[PDB]
Amino acid sequence: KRPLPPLPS
Amino acid sequence: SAEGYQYRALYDYKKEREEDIDLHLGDILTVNKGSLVALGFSDGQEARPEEIGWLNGYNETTGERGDFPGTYVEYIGRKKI
Numbered sequence: 001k002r003p004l005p006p007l008p009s
Numbered sequence: 010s011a012e013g014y015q016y017r018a019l020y021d022y023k024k025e026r027e028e029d030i031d032l033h034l035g036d037i038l039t040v041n042k043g044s045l046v047a048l049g050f051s052d053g054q055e056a057r058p059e060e061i062g063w064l065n066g067y068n069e070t071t072g073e074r075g076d077f078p079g080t081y082v083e084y085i086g087r088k089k090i
Contacts, residue, residue, distance in 0.1 A: 002063055004078050008020050 010042035013090040014055045016066070016082035030068050030075035038082060039090060040066035056084045 015037060022032035032038075045051040050061050058064055058079030067074045 004062060004080050005022070005025070007080060008022075 010046070011089060012042040012087055013039040013066075014042060014045065014087050015039055015085045016058060016064075017085050018077075018082050020081045022077060022081050024075070026076070028076050030073045030077050031071065032068070032077055032081055033070070036068050036070040037085075038064075038066045038068050038077065039088070040064050041090065042087075055087075058082050058084060 018032040018034055018036040018038065020032070021034055024031050042051060044065055045055050045061075048061070054061055061079045063076050064079045064082070065074075065076050
């Protein structure tokens with residue numbers, strides 16, 4: 001699976 | 010499918026890939042129920058997009074369609090499409 005980006009902030 | 014699962018973007022996301030869409034806080038997305046049936050997440054996990062991972066759907070707010078990270082959105086219900 002394509003890695004998810006971390007949430008911003 | 011004649012039904013869509015609806016999500017609201019909780020955070021901004023800048024597209025990182027050609028197939029991605031931008032998200033803006035408050036944008037509303039519709040994921041065709043067929044998409045989650047295809048992935049095997051239509052048995053309740055539609056309500057947990059942060060567990061599904063990447064989703065593909067239509068940004069009703071921007072008019073753009075593509076991939077977006079499920080952790081950036083909240084499930085808000087379903088509708089007929």
